[PDB]
Amino acid sequence: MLSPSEIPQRDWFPSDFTFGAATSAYQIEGAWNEDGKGESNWDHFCHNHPERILDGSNSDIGANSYHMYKTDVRLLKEMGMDAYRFSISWPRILPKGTKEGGINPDGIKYYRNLINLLLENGIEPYVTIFHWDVPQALEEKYGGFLDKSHKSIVEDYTYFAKVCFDNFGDKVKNWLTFNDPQTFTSFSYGTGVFAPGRCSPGLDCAYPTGNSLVEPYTAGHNILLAHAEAVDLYNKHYKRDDTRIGLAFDVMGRVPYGTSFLDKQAEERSWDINLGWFLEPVVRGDYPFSMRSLARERLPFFKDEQKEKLAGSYNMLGLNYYTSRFSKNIDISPNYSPVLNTDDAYASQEVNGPDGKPIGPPMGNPWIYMYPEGLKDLLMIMKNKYGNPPIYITENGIGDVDTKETPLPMEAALNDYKRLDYIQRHIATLKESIDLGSNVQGYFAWSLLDNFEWFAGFTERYGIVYVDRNNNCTRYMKESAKWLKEFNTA
Amino acid sequence: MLSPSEIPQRDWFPSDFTFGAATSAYQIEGAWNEDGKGESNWDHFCHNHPERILDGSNSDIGANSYHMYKTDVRLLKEMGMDAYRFSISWPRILPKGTKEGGINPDGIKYYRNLINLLLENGIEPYVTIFHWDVPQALEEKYGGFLDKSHKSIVEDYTYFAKVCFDNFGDKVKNWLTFNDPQTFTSFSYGTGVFAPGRCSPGLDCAYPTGNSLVEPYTAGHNILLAHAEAVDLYNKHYKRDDTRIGLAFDVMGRVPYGTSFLDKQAEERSWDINLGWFLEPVVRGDYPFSMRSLARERLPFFKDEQKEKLAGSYNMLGLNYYTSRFSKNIDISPNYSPVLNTDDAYASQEVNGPDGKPIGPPMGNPWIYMYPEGLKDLLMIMKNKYGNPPIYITENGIGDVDTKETPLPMEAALNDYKRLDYIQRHIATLKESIDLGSNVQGYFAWSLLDNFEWFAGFTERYGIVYVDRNNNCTRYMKESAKWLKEFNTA
């Protein structure tokens, strides 16, 4: 348990530092087929493959934030949050996903009202343009981000961004093109645990007719081109001195498994395939050398023109941090063959070190182990290797397990001391990292609300604010939310 | 240049520290076809392709050390050298390079007498078994180290090794299986400037029908297998508590060209392809990860049993250092295709940094630039990354250019102050390295004598002792030799 002097204080950070909460459209909105909203890959996947969701649920209602946005703002305001990061639903704005399909007026109106209400309450909006919700129309037309041409999806995404810029740009000063590109490509096309659920034949996913060694890279390539093109557009016609744009990467810290220089090299390849994959291209205009030498022809090349648009295509960067892993070396040899795109790193990602102990105490769900040190390591890397750009921890939190077999009593769900302790530690880590020179400028507690958790469905509660789906999605502040309130209010 | 207090003193090093000089058989012996000595790849290359030698010479005479070894020993004694590193001519011991061809008694006689003379004069012999002089018989039989079976050359070398252990093991306490395996493979089969002169079609060498991207690796693989087999034989039947065996690697220091992390990565790949290529296998039993990822199938895999014999196959390691280079990153791209095996590191090795200035002052010939710091970097790498094993700088020196067009007058050749300054600086660097914890135990000035310099023929004088080939290879000490004498006997 942290001691009194170890609990972070708002005044530990500069006056302009940003503290907020975050969410994603498909996870909280609900109203999935309401007011003209088009169907998304996730609507499709959940409805057609409930057996691929842990509890067979879907986000038809989620946290019902489409209808309850005023309450979400009230909660953010009561907590004294400086900002709120949320995402826009592509199919809710462009039901057909394209210009020809037309812009959905109600979709525009919804985010318009949410943005104005936030600003009216002094909360700065950090708008994520895309969070895995691809219009099913594009998915059917050309496989969405699997688009072999590297043109259709890029054009349609760019137009989608243009729509957000045209309608919200006068109000929004912070844009995030993508969120978690690595998890999206690896889970949607590698292990196929995410919509549309594709993987190599022989693997266990809904559609074992893809290629876990190629499709993740194809999609990743399209995401980068889309990002570069959107940023080019924003810069040319929408940017203002006081506005910024970037993207957020999902990243787990990497620590050498053992003492051999071999594990340090494995650790190196691991940061590369996780963070480098999408970060290096926006920083320097191309993928990490490691990945190029290992994925080879399975990793598409950029044109010199694309490298240019990509290099430096951001004013700030988001970092979604939750845990870390020990990276253990795997030699190139006839005995080993990569199966998943992530195997190209030639390193196993271990939870337990050589002493058989976990890298950090388990937080509850199957993958989160508390290791704040990794966040510092990550920040030091951003600082010393990637130009120390403005950083925002766009996601940080834990999931409280709550299953039909082992329900989490409301009272316990509210007394989320483990979550509180975890959040406090990472915030403390940021304070340390800042003193060390890290250009981090904000922290967003992940999940303002308890909501849908993709393949985990509703088996986990990540919110700092409880949502009782049994009672009109009523929100109740958890101890974590209450401390943050005290923190920002102090 | 170096102030009085900066000049190294013998008392700067431990009393057991070793100071010596070195040479190689083909470069100094002469008597290429005397007393039953068989023809070597180098005898063949020089005689058949004199046009591939800068001054069209050969080493039929060299420094005539076969007949003049006695004076070589006297010089070494005069300088108070602790040890003498020389190599054994494979074809002189085994004219047909094999057991069936029989052992040549005169060959055994010569080295046996050199060894006894050295010892009776208190000079420790450090014997290099192979220094590029492959019996032509084996070359014609199966291409020598190009042996596609990875069997014949291995057994023939092992037997050659056995012959050496049998006849000299009782007196020799320090063995070096190979010397400069990287230069040998790269120059003999990559650029083709070394015997037999093979390179990829389209390249300029005597036999542009090889493969500069494959043959260097094949030969390298055979060298490693040969080494492991010889060390295994040695450890099982000849090694005594006071004897040691290893090999020596040629290595240029690598420094990132610019300040980008990309050049640090390039620097990394450069150490790997130059030093790691042969070092990592004898340390851990396999090639560097970088090389396997880049050379791929052109880099043979070791059987588990071979990996076992290779890992830890040495009691000491030799390092042949002369200069360093700035490693500049080269991205993997459809625009770049490796032509030479060395291009596999995706890094250009530059003499001049971004400021257009050379990494170090030019020492005279076309490739040596004085950069003592590079030696320290190398020693620290050995220390912190490769187990800090006993290290002997088995080679270090410079080559005084002496051509027909621009002869080096004897007076100018004897007053080799550039060489003297260069040697004193590297010796100082060893003292600094020892203080940093380096496990270096000795230093060998390269070229006891002025001699044949491979493709450079006699256009360069690397000796600390002048050899007047015009007279009868009469030897005269240079200022460098005189200082070393003062140094050792002070």
Structure-token match 């000491």, residue found: B316
Residue A99: Cβ-neighbour burial (10 angstroms; 0-12, 13-18, 19+)? middle
Shortest distance, CA B278 to any CA of chain A (angstroms): 16
Q: Is B286 part of the contact surface with chain A (CB cutoff 8 Å)?
A: yes
Q: How far is CA B105 from CA A377, B155, B181, in A?
A: 66, 21, 28
**Would you list the DSSP string of A93-125?**
H-TTSSTTT---HHHHHHHHHHHHHHHHTT-EE
Q: How far is CA B410 from CA B201, B398, B402, B472, in A?
A: 43, 17, 10, 15
What are B184's two structure tokens? Answer: 């040998």
Contact predicate A323/A369, CB 8 Å: yes
Q: How far, rounded to the nearest angstrom, does the alpha carbon of residue B105 sit from its chain's CA centroid? A: 27
Q: Is A385 part of the contact surface with chain B (CB cutoff 8 Å)?
A: yes
CA dist A360 and A69 (Å) reads 36
Q: Is A368 part of the contact surface with chain B (CB cutoff 8 Å)?
A: no
- Kindly report the backbone phi and psi dihedral angles of residue B248, in degrees, each rounded to the nearest multiple of 5, phi listed first: -125, 135
Neighbours of B159 (CB within 10 A): 19
Exposed e or buried b per residue across A67-88, where buried means at least 16 C-beta atoms within 10 angstroms of its C-beta: bbbebbbebbbbbbbbbbbbbb
Breaks (C-N over 2.5 A) in chain A follow: none
CA dist B188 and B133 (Å) reads 12
Residue A59: Cβ-neighbour burial (10 angstroms; 0-12, 13-18, 19+)? buried
Q: Who's near A135: CB < 8 A, 6+ residues apart?
A: A38, A39, A40, A41, A90, A91, A94, A95, A96, A97, A144
Resolution (A): 2.2
Among positive and negative, which fits the CA dihedral A477, A483, A487, A490?
A: positive
Neighbours of B355 (CB within 10 A): 6
Domain boundaries, chain A: 1-490
**DSSP strands (E only) in B330-399:** 347-350, 391-395
Structure-token match 């399909």, residue found: A101
Contact predicate A235/A164, CB 8 Å: no
Residue B462: Cβ-neighbour burial (10 angstroms; 0-12, 13-18, 19+)? buried
Query: B 329-348 residues with CB below 8 A of A?
Result: 329, 331-334, 346
Q: Who's near B172: CB < 8 A, 6+ residues apart?
A: B115, B125, B127, B164, B243
Residue A121: Cβ-neighbour burial (10 angstroms; 0-12, 13-18, 19+)? middle
CA dist A303 and A319 (Å) reads 27
* Calculated CA dihedral for residues A201, A203, A205, A210, nearest 10 degrees: -30
What is the helix (H) or strand (E) element at residue B75, kind and residue range? helix B65-78
Identity of the amino acid at A234: Y
CA dist A467 and A461 (Å) reads 9
Enumerate the H helices of A33-172 as residue ranges.
Answer: 41-48, 65-78, 90-93, 105-120, 136-142, 152-168
Residue A120: Cβ-neighbour burial (10 angstroms; 0-12, 13-18, 19+)? exposed
What's the DSSP call for residue B224? Answer: H
Neighbours of A451 (CB within 10 A): 28
| B322: helix, strand or coil | strand
What is the helix (H) or strand (E) element at residue A267, kind and residue range? helix A261-271
Exposed e or buried b per residue across B194-207, where buried means at least 16 C-beta atoms within 10 angstroms of its C-beta: bbbbbbbeebebbe
Exposed e or buried b per residue across A156-187, where buried means at least 16 C-beta atoms within 10 angstroms of its C-beta: bbbbbbbbbbebbbeebbbbbbbbbbbbbbbb
What's the DSSP call for residue A17? Answer: -
What's the DSSP call for residue B344? Answer: G
Identity of the amino acid at A388: N
The count of residues in chain B is: 490
Residue of B269, B328, B332 best to disrupt the A interface, most CBs of A under 10 A: B332
Q: Who's near A302: CB < 8 A, 6+ residues apart?
A: A221, A224, A225, A281, A285, A286, A310
Chain B hits for A333, CB-CB cut-off 8 Å, are 292, 301
CA dist A50 and A57 (Å) reads 6
The count of residues in chain A is: 490
Q: At what angle do helices B417-435 and B479-489 cross, to 10 degrees?
A: 40
Contact predicate A490/A81, CB 8 Å: no
Contact predicate B315/B246, CB 8 Å: yes
Q: Is A284 part of the contact surface with chain B (CB cutoff 8 Å)?
A: yes
Contact predicate B259/B281, CB 8 Å: no
CA dist A287 and A185 (Å) reads 15
Q: Which residues pair with B442 in a beta bridge?
A: B18, B392
Neighbours of B130 (CB within 10 A): 29
CA dist A94 and A141 (Å) reads 15
Determined by X-ray
Q: Who's near B164: CB < 8 A, 6+ residues apart?
A: B88, B93, B127, B129, B172, B175
Write down the number of H helices and E strands in chain B: 17, 13
CA dist A112 and A155 (Å) reads 24
Q: How far is CA A176 from CA A250, A317, A370, in A?
A: 13, 8, 26
CA-nearest of B464, B454, B456 to B43 is B454
Chain B hits for A294, CB-CB cut-off 8 Å, are 293
Q: Which residues pair with B449 in a beta bridge?
A: B465
The full 3-state SS of A272-323, as one line of letters, equals HHHHHHHHHHHHHCCCCHHHHHHHHHHCCCCCHHHHHHHCCCCCEEEEEEEE
What would you measure as the largest C-alpha separation in chain A, in angstroms? 62
Neighbours of B336 (CB within 10 A): 11
Q: At what angle do helices A181-189 and A215-237 cross, to 10 degrees?
A: 150
- Kindly report the backbone phi and psi dihedral angles of residue B430, in degrees, each rounded to the nearest multiple of 5, phi listed first: -70, -40
- Kindly report the backbone phi and psi dihedral angles of residue B244, in degrees, each rounded to the nearest multiple of 5, phi listed first: -140, 155
CA-nearest of A29, A133, A92, A19 to A467 is A29
Chain A hits for B347, CB-CB cut-off 8 Å, are none
Chain B hits for A301, CB-CB cut-off 8 Å, are 333-334
What's the DSSP call for residue B191? Answer: S
CA angle A219, A223, A229 (to 5 degrees): 145
- Kindly report the backbone phi and psi dihedral angles of residue A389, in degrees, each rounded to the nearest multiple of 5, phi listed first: -80, 165
Chain A hits for B289, CB-CB cut-off 8 Å, are 262, 265, 329, 331-332, 346
A with B: how many residue pairs have Cβ under 8 Å apart? 36
Q: Who's near A140: CB < 8 A, 6+ residues apart?
A: none
Cross-chain Cβ contact B333/A301 below 8 Å = yes
Q: Who's near B158: CB < 8 A, 6+ residues apart?
A: B226, B229, B230, B233
CA dist B130 and B93 (Å) reads 12
CA dist B437 and B346 (Å) reads 32
Cross-chain Cβ contact A262/B289 below 8 Å = yes
Q: Is A472 part of the contact surface with chain B (CB cutoff 8 Å)?
A: no
Nearest to B331 among A262, A289, A334 (CB): A289
- Kindly report the backbone phi and psi dihedral angles of residue A100, in degrees, each rounded to the nearest multiple of 5, phi listed first: -55, -35
Q: A1-490: which CATH architecture?
A: Alpha-Beta Barrel (3.20)
Contact predicate A340/A403, CB 8 Å: no
